[PDB]
Amino acid sequence: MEGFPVRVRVDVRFRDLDPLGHVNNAVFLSYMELARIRYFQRIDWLEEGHFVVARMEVDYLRPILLGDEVFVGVRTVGLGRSSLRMEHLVTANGESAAKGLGVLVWLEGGRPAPLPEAIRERIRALEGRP
Amino acid sequence: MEGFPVRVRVDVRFRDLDPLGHVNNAVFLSYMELARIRYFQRISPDWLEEGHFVVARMEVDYLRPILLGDEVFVGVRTVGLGRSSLRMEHLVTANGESAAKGLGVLVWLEGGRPAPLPEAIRERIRALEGRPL
Numbered sequence: 237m238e239g240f241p242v243r244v245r246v247d248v249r250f251r252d253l254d255p256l257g258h259v260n261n262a263v264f265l266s267y268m269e270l271a272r273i274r275y276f277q278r279i280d281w282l283e284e285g286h287f288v289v290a291r292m293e294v295d296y297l298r299p300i301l302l303g304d305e306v307f308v309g310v311r312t313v314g315l316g317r318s319s320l321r322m323e324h325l326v327t328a329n330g331e332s333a334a335k336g337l338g339v340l341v342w343l344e345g346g347r348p349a350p351l352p353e354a355i356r357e358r359i360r361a362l363e364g365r366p
Numbered sequence: 367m368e369g370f371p372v373r374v375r376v377d378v379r380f381r382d383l384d385p386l387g388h389v390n391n392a393v394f395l396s397y398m399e400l401a402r403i404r405y406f407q408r409i410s411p412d413w414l415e416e417g418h419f420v421v422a423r424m425e426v427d428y429l430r431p432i433l434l435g436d437e438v439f440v441g442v443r444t445v446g447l448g449r450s451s452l453r454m455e456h457l458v459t460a461n462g463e464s465a466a467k468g469l470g471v472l473v474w475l476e477g478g479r480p481a482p483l484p485e486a487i488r489e490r491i492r493a494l495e496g497r498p499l
């Protein structure tokens with residue numbers, strides 16, 4: 237997916253659907269998550285890289301139907317002190333279906349702490365940006 | 367829940383947890399959704415069709431982690447009415463403390479496309495809220 241360093245495929249499940257036959261709003265975040273976890277695996281993925289989700293902003297652009305070909309890309313768009321801002325793009329049949337902006341927070345001892353330089357450099361390398 | 371006309375209780379499932387033992391970010395939206403649906407049930411019979419609304423946007427702030435065993439309540443209320451849209455605030459509490467807040471934009475559909483919220487639905491919302499809206 238152009239503009240995104242990591243992208244994954246997801247198969248729409250019957251279980252993902254609302255009664256009218258389109259993907260449920262919360263399930264979109266699980267699609268976005270698969271991409272983010274794969275991205276974290278590159279920069280303790282079971283511990284979500286020691287990051288916790290502090291905020292998620294999602295715009296649902298087009299409904300996702302059973303059988304749709306779905307891809308999800310993810311990239312870092314901001315690097316803070318203890319936070320990381322990530323953009324996730326879910327497409328259905330080549331069309332943008334949802335955009336999610338998430339704020340991830342690095343924890344140490346269960347409290348926010350400055351992202352380690354080791355993680356910052358791996359992110360800069362992955363994104364190819366300073 | 368003070369300030370919310372509709373609230374529901376949620377039981378945290380083992381299935382709801384991330385490996386570290388706290389509730390998954392996406393599951394929080396399903397908690398919020400239960401209250402929203404219960405609310406729509408108060409205004410319309412077509413609740414399976416989600417009151418004919420589709421979620422256009424959700425803004426969720428995760429304030430505190432929710433753990434297995436936590437006593438969870440979810441309150442929901444309409445904070446604004448648009449043309450074909452409406453804004454709803456969802457409050458999830460865990461053991462009496464604010465765990466997450468969600469602001470959602472719901473859009474009313476007719477024939478599969480946005481249409482003005484009917485007066486009948488608006489009147490019921492205003493009645494359920496019992497406050498200027």
Ligand SMILES: CC(C)(COP(=O)(O)OP(=O)(O)OC[C@@H]1O[C@H](n2cnc3c(N)ncnc32)[C@@H](O)[C@@H]1OP(=O)(O)O)[C@@H](O)C(=O)NCCC(=O)NCCS
Nearest residue numbers: 288289290291316317318319341348391427428429430431
């Ligand atoms: C994430 C969490 C640790 C933040 O706690 P906090 O008291 O806000 O800590 P701070 O405000 O000092 O954290 C730093 C800030 O995080 C931010 N942040 C936290 N919540 C935010 C939000 N809702 N929106 C935007 N930014 C937020 C920052 O903007 C700032 O980042 P910075 O370090 O780059 O300056 C806490 O809210 C969390 O425990 N809530 C539950 C998270 C939930 O469990 N995630 C779902 C499971 S993964």
Ligand SMILES: CC(C)(COP(=O)(O)OP(=O)(O)OC[C@@H]1O[C@H](n2cnc3c(N)ncnc32)[C@@H](O)[C@@H]1OP(=O)(O)O)[C@@H](O)C(=O)NCCC(=O)NCCS
Nearest residue numbers: 261295296297298299420421422423448449450451473480
């Ligand atoms: C929601 C949806 C019907 C909107 O289609 P659209 O072409 O943008 O329709 P319009 O722009 O004419 O709708 C009117 C606008 O909706 C808004 N709206 C739509 N998307 C919005 C967003 N992402 N954020 C804020 N407002 C939004 C308005 O702000 C405005 O409302 P108004 O009637 O009060 O003026 C369409 O994007 C939807 O099919 N996306 C998929 C939704 C998804 O399936 N939900 C998950 C399952 S419930």
Ligand SMILES: [Zn+2]
Nearest residue numbers: 284288384390
């Ligand atoms: Zn987690």
Ligand SMILES: [Zn+2]
Nearest residue numbers: 254260416420
């Ligand atoms: Zn739906």
